[model samples]
Target chain A: MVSWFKKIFKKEEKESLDKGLEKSSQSFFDKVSRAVKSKVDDEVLDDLEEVLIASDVGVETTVKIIRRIEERVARDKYVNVAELNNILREEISGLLLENPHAGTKKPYVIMVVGVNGVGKTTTIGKLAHQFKSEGLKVVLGAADTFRAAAVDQLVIWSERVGVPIVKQAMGSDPASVAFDTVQSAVSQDADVVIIDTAGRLHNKVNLMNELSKIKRVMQKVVPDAPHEVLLVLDGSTGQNAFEQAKQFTAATEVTALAVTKLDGTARGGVVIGISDQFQVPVKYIGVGEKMQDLQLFNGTEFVDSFFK
Target chain B: HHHMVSWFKKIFKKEEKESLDKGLEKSSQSFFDKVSRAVVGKSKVDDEVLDDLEEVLIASDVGVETTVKIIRRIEERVARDKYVNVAELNNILREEISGLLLENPHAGTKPYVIMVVGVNGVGKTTTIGKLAHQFKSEGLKVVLGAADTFRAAAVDQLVIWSERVGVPIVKQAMGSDPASVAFDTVQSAVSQDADVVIIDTAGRLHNKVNLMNELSKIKRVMQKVVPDAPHEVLLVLDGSTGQNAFEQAKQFTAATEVTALAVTKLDGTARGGVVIGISDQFQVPVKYIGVGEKMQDLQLFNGTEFVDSFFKK
Candidate 1:
């Protein structure tokens, strides 16, 4: 068994996790306090559920998480507030486990998917720069050929990340770009393929189908291509991310989620709710405008940050 | 291509679907017959009946806050329409909900200049395309605004929608000023005199102050070009979000004048209550709802239809 509930590390790591979610933790402080104040465990659970639900965590998922906590408390009597936080963190970690992708490999093939202006391009660019700095090469596919500027943005990111980009002119086939991105990665032996998808916002069903096609196309070029579908969401958007997450997850096989713009608004409580509500694990968080603002999601870190 | 249709199949139980069908029966069963049934039992509007009706609306996912408002509206009308038998409550509710649809002034405008606003992932672009498709089928000339420039994916998505709906879309490159795109859209509308101009804008409040300024610039530019341009600012919030969507709408309203809402993905979750809650809480009319991915899936927010469908037999 792992030493920690899910982090597989020590209490110091929990401290680090808490530090990482400072933005989110501070974001939810007031509401969590009220929930804790009611002093009734069920009321605490309801208020917790409300915070998550209000945070844009789906209702059903919030209830499920609360139930798990209820079970834990029942099995282990006399669990104090401090213990509750840990139990909550473990439950969140358990939620992340529902999905099989542990995100183990370097140059993790994370394909960012979301509607327009959700910051997919910037997120990828930042990810490219950050991962490349880690001594891993990141290749970008400017597959959003329908929009001329899509290519230009990717081009800009290519310079930012100092990585090579495989792109076509405006209106180029997205699948073709995906194939070429992987092909170039194979030839150049690049560490990651962060394909910038085009045709992002207009069609819901099409979005799902296109990603599936992209997934299938990528597999043909590189077996086990698009190992992860990271749906980028505008965290500043609040509850809307929940529906977007639902619609997107329903439409596509989104394995992970990234909630951006937490630094700007205290609505950062959203990240906690989203993780609690959605089965998809929160993998990366965009804390600020800086390139390094993107950080891997640590569930224990998130719960402690938000609750403490 | 359409996963939402099948997703409901996987997520909803037969009982849940049946319950929704029952909810529909409440709103849509019959206007005249409902009144007759109400009169057959109670001569006056019973608080108990109103309470039961409120629960039904909640079940329909109209949300608690909005349902309470709707219930209150009916209660007032019950007071006004004295001798208001329980029989007339159904018809009164139908009228009340349809009236809520007309609450926003621009709701009556032909080819309403609705600026579709939301952060990117909320499906603003897709919702626009779906709107165009629905409006076009209804014989309206729809023009699109691809104003979400910070990314090329946005422009591409809008373009794809334009083609799917067979409407013209005004677009600029990634990082191009969104205001310029909105300007060009109104320009196209003036030349075409289109029935509606659904302009897409940046999803994130990128920066709320900056977003307000940017959106204002788009509005100013469009208004300079088209009279009463952007008659409605329709914020599209995903319904499945439960409360997260609520917080977004809450934050967004502080940032912009969100007059109408297009709640998406009600078919995916029973928590569709967020839509009613948002609509009632914000008092912004829910102009459209996405029940499915088909062009026809974007249902007009007929409170009765929604209530009926959600709380159907």
Candidate 2:
């Protein structure tokens, strides 16, 4: 009875998630249903592997998932389609890290990083909105001083969110911009600060150097500044998301992840492979364009919705 | 000194062929290993072998669509012959893969304009620099257009490349209109009587509508200066990114009329097989491949040579 009551309580929150993940879930089930006619066999497993790969679950992670399923089948000697879905849900969820807790640092700093065109700036905007709505003092840093109109776009977001932002002119040193933003946030006694970094991938050496400089400079004002290094990725991208995660994590210490643009793409299965591959926990997921579409990631809930 | 220099040039020409072989060595070795494993304990090309072959192709980053096409072709052949030996599979595969790749034609017109486009980190700027170097070495006047004003230091990077290649460049300050820069570039190229004009466009794929509009505007603006400006719309792809290169090709082709492709950064990756899938799926000929960092490392692509090198033992 209590469990039923809990389900009723969580229904509203889960509804939006269901709606947001409608396309991904539908596409996934369409392929899986065909693969699982009645009984789980070698042919079924092979087809299932292809489906996972085609869904952008990635080759390595898909192989691991397949092996796990094969082990289950070996143990049981006979597994039905009904049991296959349950096994997938459990195995996929088990591979993911638990949801990260909110940091306790006063003026908790988040340094968002990703390549351009991955919705990094928009994620910051949504984050600011979400934090500000929670009655926290939010501050934004426009340190992505490389891309044209990037500062202006963030400024517009700050204005929309009614939060103060610190920025420098275009082509300014990104580290300097980060330094100024952190100092300004400290002076303002803000509860949270988000620093944006340029997304350039000319070379790994240059990328590593630039990201390292930003972290070092920000540490001057707050020794443990950038409490969370959030790496944002476009969930719509296929194998590229893995490459970006590998590149960014190798370049810097990524503390958390935010997978964006999962609203309309069937490739949202990429999140499963990425979360399984990367050690960092996914903190947030952008489902739609609305500021409220950015939801805190829950692995079990994500796997449940994905299979559903 | 002249004889010695000629000798060095002769050695460099041979080195270019060796470099092509070396650049493709990783991809070739990896592909051969996978195919060898797939055909193990199999005498004839059967359904199971075909299935394994399909997985091998997909895993090699040939992409799903192109892999399915290749598999279907092989399956049809197997049905017709009813007895295809496993030993002959590589030859059949090589012929089919080579046949899928489109052939690049020779460059056209004096003041031939090539507007280069790609996402960030695909070596678009470097490809342009190399093209400029190659053309300038041939005694052809080349002018570069730094229209990629969106990224900071992008113009400066092109400026440096221009100075390095000793070619003329037209550029504007950061955040200037890329279309205006393209206009200025064509006008300058016409005035300078340049044989080639290479314009670099900003790399952004976040908003498809905006990117399409921006590229269309650049083309329209350039045409005002030269009616047949931008003779080639080359889309550059990072050979290491595998399937992502296919996605970039799709997105870029939808954004503009991509006439050719340039697969870059193939020196250290086993994912150069992506070029086959991209060229097949997009129906765009790959004109150049960046095998190494040297300016002359950007080789004019030869489909036959590529397939031969890919299957080379």
Candidate 3:
């Protein structure tokens, strides 16, 4: 039954992946293909800039991309359109990958980080289902004690996924919950442990310091606990996601990215920009509001299937 | 602001031409005078001006990230297109800043759904009221949503806006699911054929998990009612708090999908740079900014206009 489900999952995943990237793929590819016809680097550069801005990369990031590419173009002496895609991709992928949380160590503990309303919890819940489908031991630490409603929601999700969640009452200290979650995950030999942090970004110094402290607390148990700090953003939020990503990156060591709510929306271009703009490898995206809406981020499939 | 204008009107009961001249004499004098003094010594994009510019933005409550960005653009622009002449620096600054704002690709289309969100006391309700006043006066069928269900005060505040603007509102009792209110609001707009719906979602980022859930519920409920509703999730940040605004935006974006951005309370602070930095850094277009307390004080982020206005005038 499990094996059969995996086969079905693969096919459905492809369908969903295509759905997520549908809007971006068409718009992005059309621009890319059009720019390829231009022999001049300036024309190609202009086209890329427009496409990036259209993707909600914002002017600053677009400028950054143009600047980075300008250096490479100057050094390499005028690259072709086709080469531009690969080169731009390389640059963007490199930028996102710069913060490096890449690896595969079964149930690799990932601590999700974001501010308040970025669909981080739903993304996490979806991730739980995704990893669990692979038969990994996934334990969620409801260390976010800021809101009773938040805790209750996670508890509901945990039950929905048939997973275990380590939680405390509302207003409980987040670090303690994380400590307990990681320690228990290690003791239980759990394949994965996901910890939630108190989502507050207004207190910049305190937010960073608290995040750093949480990291320290987590490392106490698994030594390298929270092997990944997945920064979640709602891709549908378009440019806002870029802003949030910038703030969170500045606020914490966000290693991986998960952009949700991209089933069908114009803002789907955000994934491309974020991937290219922030240089953080997008590991997952939520396309719909189902238990299985979340899927692992596959770049090739994303580019091909995403965007209409 | 209304009082200020009315006071001027009362004192100058002269003819239209006289009143018009007097209007400039009274109001424009103060603002223009301040700008004059502000840029008196600066001749070019000097370190002093840049410092002052940065301080101005910081005071306006634009985040440091955005301030750095605006400054970087001016630096690069000065190097490339124009000289960093201190004499023309103010004009150059305004031109560049407004130019930057005017150029956001994700600029809203009409019938835009601007979900006004912020912590209480940030004038979330008042801003919505003013926005309704502005939008309605523009002949748009504006609708209001009392979705900040956490507190009854939020609902009452929005009600005040609806009455003041003479726009219709869709609201539920306090503690109700915000999504339902959003649903009713959008549904009403769709049926009555409204142009915009400003739904209120207030400072409720208690934590990541819960915040995400509430936003999800609201979003889901909205989409359920209207297939592609809530066009813009506009996060409202208080400009008076400067970096604190950035921090709040960070947390808000983390929890829910905030599509657009609105920074309020710019009249008091020079932290306006936060808007530029916050917008640039977050990639969220600084859609609307509240420069004054009046309805007309809120301006759509015309980057070029803003850059030009602040620097030039």
Candidate 1: regions farther than 4 A off: A1-20, A34-49, A68-110, A199-202, A212-220, A269-280, B1-313
Best by TM-score: 2
Model 3 DockQ vs. reference: 0.01
**Which candidate should be chosen as best, given lDDT against the real structure?**
2
Give the TM-score of chain B in candidate 3: 0.72
lDDT at position A202, candidate 3 = 43
Interface RMSD of each: 18.4, 20.1, 18.4
- For model 1, residues A217-274, the per-residue Cα lDDT tens digits are 8887677778888888777655556555666677678788888876665456556556
Indicate whether candidate 1 or candidate 3 has the larger DockQ.
1
- What TM-score, to 2 decimals, does candidate 3 have? 0.45
Residue A225 in candidate 1, Cα distance off native in Å: 2.5
Candidate 3 segments whose C-alpha is farther than 4 A from its true place? A1-9, A25-48, A58-107, A277-279, A306-308, B1-313
In model 1, the Cα lDDT at residue A306 comes to: 58
lDDT tens string, model 2, A1-308? 00111122157557767777889888878977865567777657756765776677865677678777777787876788778678889887765533223111677999998765568889999999989999999999998886545688899999999999998877899999899998999899999999988764334467788888998998988888879899987776556566557767876898888888887877788877776677676678887888877877776677788886
Candidate 2 clash pair list: none
Which numbered prediction scores highest in DockQ against the true structure? 1
Measured on C-alpha atoms, candidate 2 has an lDDT of 0.77
